[PDB]
């Protein structure tokens, strides 16, 4: 359908911490991580901007194919059993599709998009669907090297495509790098608040748990940070741009969505 600027329901949240490692600190991923852990841990999420040094093909772009899942954004939180399959794309074709979706729906700022996104999930006025592809030097920052010192997965997102609330498989971290494209909005909740979040969800969305007692492992439910906040849950926003990492901590709840066509890669680790 279309944007509705005056119906924006943008969450009012504290920012998660940002880290600007120096070239030295940056030569050992695992170590730098341990080093920021004490200050970042209490937020459950943090963002990491690589130093100037750090730098990260036509026929992959044009040729390599992947499949997608369909998401009904208006039904991620409010509904009376998830993401059906969608068409096959290439990056090239996905982008043309993604860009057109946005151009028609709306150039908005991130807060414009964020305000609309939560409007769509908290108070939708129209069905709205969206597609995404998921699970497709020398240093651990090149995520293919980290299992060494579990494998890296790739994610193609578009405006409004979502990763719904969850905690990583075990007590695992996850490290996420944004290769190219539009910003990814993240919401993070500290490990010590896992209880408050699940109980907040059970409280407000009782019906669902009834009919899917295992919601929390299904990755199929978005839940407003404003509602979390009302219940005393600490939620920290962060905005990941192209070329940046987002670090997720053990037992830390996290969710978000994309502000447009983008491509990102993530791995778990302890
Ligand atoms: O962005 C996604 O679709 C995946 C989210 C996730 O599970 C993670 O990497 O922490
Ligand atoms: Fe995750």
Numbering used by the authors: 139 to 194, 200 to 223, 262 to 287, 296 to 325, 350 to 362, 378 to 498
Task: Tell me what the authors wrote about this structure, in their words.
In this work we have identified a rice histone demethylase, namely JMJ703, which specifically demethylates methylated histone H3 lysine 4. Our results demonstrate that JMJ703 is essential for plant cell division and stem elongation and specifically demethylates mono-, di-, and trimethylated H3K4 in vivo and in vitro. Finally, the fragment spanning amino acids 139 to 498 (termed c-JMJ703), covering the JmjN and JmjC domains, was deemed to be suitable for crystallographic investigation. The c-JMJ703 molecule presented a canonical overall folding of JMJD2 proteins and contained four of the five domains defined in the structure of c-JMJD2A: the JmjN domain (A139-K199), the long β-hairpin (D200-T271), the mixed domain (L272-V377) and the JmjC domain (L378-A498).
